[PDB]
Amino acid sequence: STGPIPGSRKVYQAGELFPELRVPFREVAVHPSANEPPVTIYDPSGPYSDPAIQIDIEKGLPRTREALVVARGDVEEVADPRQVKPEDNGFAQGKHLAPEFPDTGRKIYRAKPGKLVTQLEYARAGIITAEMEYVAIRENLRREQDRPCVRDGEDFGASIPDFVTPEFVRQEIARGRAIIPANINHGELEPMAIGRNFLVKINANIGNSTVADEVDKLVWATRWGADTVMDLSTGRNIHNIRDWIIRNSSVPIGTVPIYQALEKVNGVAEDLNWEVFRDTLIEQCEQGVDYFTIHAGVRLPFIPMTAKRVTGIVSRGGSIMAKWCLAHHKENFLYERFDEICEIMRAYDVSFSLGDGLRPGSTADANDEAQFSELRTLGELTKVAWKHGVQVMIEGPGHVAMHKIKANMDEQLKHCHEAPFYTLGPLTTDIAPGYDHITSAIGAAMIGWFGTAMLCYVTPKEHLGLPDRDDVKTGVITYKLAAHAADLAKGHPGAAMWDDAISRARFEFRWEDQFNLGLDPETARKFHDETLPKEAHKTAHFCSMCGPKFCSMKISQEVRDFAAGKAPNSAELGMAEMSEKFREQGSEIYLKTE
Amino acid sequence: STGPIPGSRKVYQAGELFPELRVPFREVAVHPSANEPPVTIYDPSGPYSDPAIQIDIEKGLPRTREALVVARGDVEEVADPRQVKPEDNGFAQGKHLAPEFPDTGRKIYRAKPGKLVTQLEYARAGIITAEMEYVAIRENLRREQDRPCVRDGEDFGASIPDFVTPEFVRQEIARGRAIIPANINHGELEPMAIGRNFLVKINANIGNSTVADEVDKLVWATRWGADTVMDLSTGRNIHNIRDWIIRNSSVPIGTVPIYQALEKVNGVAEDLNWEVFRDTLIEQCEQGVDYFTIHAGVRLPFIPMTAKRVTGIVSRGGSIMAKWCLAHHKENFLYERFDEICEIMRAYDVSFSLGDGLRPGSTADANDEAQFSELRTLGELTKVAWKHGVQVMIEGPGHVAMHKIKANMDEQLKHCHEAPFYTLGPLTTDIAPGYDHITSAIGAAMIGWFGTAMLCYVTPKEHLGLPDRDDVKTGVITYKLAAHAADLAKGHPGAAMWDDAISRARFEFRWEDQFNLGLDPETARKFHDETLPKEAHKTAHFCSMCGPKFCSMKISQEVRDFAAGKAPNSAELGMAEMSEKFREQGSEIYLKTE
Ligand code: SF4
Ligand code: SF4
């Protein structure tokens, strides 16, 4: 559903370098007598929360980024785009074929030969793009550079600034420590950053009923805090379904190209080759997929290392490549043709998301040789992708017990050269199906605290079945707090502000504000009556009005001078005064100011 | 509700030193062709899960411990027990007075003068009681001493044994590192241990409708894993309600004596004195309350230290003592009469649970001077209580960000001399009301991993309202996994066994077993059809049947000898063999054994 998020309001901040920009937020005003500024919150929901914008899925979200991508003059319009083929939708026809999105008036772009295109390429060129200033404003949460907040935490050697400037964003991208998944063909996108030195982001998974039901999956997820969304659709209508998704997505769209590639060859893993895969890549690039999960780490001699595992290979896309490597006994062609993949993704600025094909499916299989062999392989591929100018982030576990979480983070930073980490959890235990959104939340907060850039969410009933509309919301909210719990522990400038604002709300009995500042206001406002008086009782501690602290005198006397107690002190009589004033003021610990 | 827990069966193990004992568990049998022993699980649910025992709340659970407490010959029957007074139930009469429990045929015991009574006193005397062997059997999970499991984890210097012997239990109690909350007047109790070197325990809170509805709160909580239960009932009928609870409780019952004491004096905190409090103590001791939460740490000069807090004093019982200390300006009488309190609790073997009166209610107020001042005070009181022969455990936060969790654990171990830790969470963030069962689960697992003995649960909608019947179950399950996630990380002998059993269950497609081993089988079995064939597909990795590993030869050749690749290797031709056999066997990664 759409409409303004309960208890909040969509607000924007314009750009300085790029006055065209309108960075989105949602503010939550507090009670007038609280004397506090409104609380600014990160908002990936997009134009669906803005009551000033009418969204028609048959038309798609307005391409507010397109005007500035062309303005760079590095992109050109593809004279002959790639027409949709029968196998793109699983050879579906007639009434069984998904409704084609009217993408008639949408220009498809490709980089001009010789010209720079990717954010990484711009960054290393000393160029600050529109997207870089966009995420800079967004990361500061509309907070003044003149007024920071005293941060208190442990980021384990991270380089988190007090204020995110567009120049700072460029530098993080320049050294591959942060990425901005922004395909040139995704004009509907509201740019976001992914890095250890920024806010922790989360991902919500959707995929394939009516296409409107699939678009609603996208809207529902992003409404409640999902930063990026992946279309893990399989089977038929993969192409047409994803058309409606990307056109109506303000958040970065992720895919696993081997999914659709496998369907074009009728689920026969050995029928996969470079020919079909290259076609799938270009197909999704011209649609505007911001990042591909490519399992180019699953090398042939890594397969026997999984023979001793308890749950074996649990990655779908990773097991596909495994089955392929067993049928031909030729090296992973995503690895052998990795150079050519980079040349394609660079032309459209598609970010790399190196897959966790050999990730642990149980706590027993965690941190085994098979997992780390792939991990160190991704680090080598990261350098190869970096040298082609393609943005990179690494994917990780999985099912990991807490005492091994730190080990995973250490290996990643060393071997993947501080590239943004992307984790599915991890799940700290395997014994709680139906509550795996909580078992993974424990691990997600920990490794997010250790320095993970983005966290892929885990639905409650994940090892039980498909998630319903309420479990998706449960998953997003659960991972939004886990990301924030990590932000709070890392001492990110703008985390405690939210914590303290709602804490003072409870303290001053400002009920409406306490419910509006809640991570899930819809649930919190269920206990709110909008007709009741919006009160704001500002009080002060009784002892704060006590001058000389008589209680300190007496205790500092009975320890050093037990002889001075045989007489009415100036402290003892002073305490009798406070007892008098306390009871006279109504025997209240917190006396009201107003 | 009662009845056998879904997918499991109540099993017992007899005692060696005490053949009368019947230590309770619930086993979960796996598929016959899996060739695995049944999985033994900790079960605090009591006789309500045993279909061989008819439970009548009007009669109460059978006192199966009573026969062995009297057998020690240290206790005597109180000739004149304490009759229930009007103020015990808040001066309620007629139809507004709760139904009195028919406690006619229940002998009330008190320690004989000069004789030992508490488990600590027995332990330091070199005595192994019936309760000590009871918890030893229970902690081993019916596992053979001949067959341990290779444990892998980090307990931060804990002394966790491979096998819990009754002698080991005594030693932990002897040094105050573990306790067994076992009042002599709680014969219905199935003994349990609380310590860092044992399984992590959890607590569920109940309190005051029909008394049967309150007993159902107790049954519901313990059914799903609650180790101890506290009756935080307030207002009227506090006495009579708690009568039905303790008589029908196989788990240790906890209370906060200042709650009922405050009601006897009509909610006027300043009307509280030693006279009323001593009466309340003896009242609850003769009922069989296993441990009291006493806020004897809230000293008078600690109150002004809370003046700078964001949320101030959030502890109910702790704020009561604060208001009292402001009205008289005399030191906390629970602190000044602490010696006399110990003399009462020792006579009935009531364990100490030193309250967290000045615990943080927000992440901002975490680890402030007010909190730690009380904490170090409890450590001094712990020594005083220890020297009276009273079992002690310490209570902690609260609302703490992850980077401060370790600091809390370090202060506790040092100043409270490795006494069992009892924590309300902690909540890692303050921005997610309605999901505070998850925000606290992150902190509960972490500090439980660091070495917390017991974790007080936090209901989902805790900062929103009262928990319903489903939120209680949600809370218990959430904290049962958080406790296990901590057990798994600490590498407790018997944690990975559960994790691995359910992991092999998923791997061998043994669906029924996967659902039965789930922490919440009732939810997991919802996706289970009992009519479908109970299959058990045991398979093996294809590469495990590969002899010389041709994939290793080829990769170890192309790195050292690129010249040897211009010819069909014995490895290249051997890989063509495996490709052949792989496709001939059905192109399956995991070939079936049967
Ligand atoms: S003397 Fe009384 S009022 Fe003054 S600081 Fe101490 S407790 Fe507070
Ligand atoms: S040669 Fe083929 S079958 Fe043998 S170990 Fe390597 S991958 Fe497995």
Author numbering:
A (entry chain A), B (entry chain A): 15 to 222, 227 to 612
Q: Could you give the paper's own sentences about this structure?
A:
ThiC, the enzyme discussed here, catalyses the complex rearrangement of aminoimidazole ribonucleotide (AIR) to 4-amino-5-hydroxymethyl-2-methylpyrimidine phosphate (HMP-P) in the thiamin biosynthetic pathways of bacteria and plants 17 and is an example of a non-canonical radical SAM enzyme. The CX2CX4C motif of ThiC varies from the canonical radical SAM motif and is located near the C terminus of the sequence. The homodimeric structure of Caulobacter crescentus ThiC (CcThiC) showed a (β/α)8-barrel fold and suggested that the cluster-binding domain, which was disordered, resides near the C terminus and inserts into the active site of an adjacent protomer through domain swapping. The cluster-binding domain inserts into the active site of an adjacent catalytic domain through domain swapping as previously predicted.
One structure of CcThiC and one structure of AtThiC stand apart and provide insight into conformational changes occurring in ThiC. In the holo CcThiC structure, the entire C-terminal cluster-binding domain and [4Fe-4S] cluster are clearly defined; however, the cluster-binding domain extends away from the active site and the cluster itself is ~25 Å from its active site location. (v) The positioning of the [4Fe-4S] cluster in the active site, along with two structures lacking SAH or L-Met and 5′-dAdo, suggests that the tethered ThiC cluster-binding domain moves into the ThiC active site to initiate catalysis and out of the active site to release products.
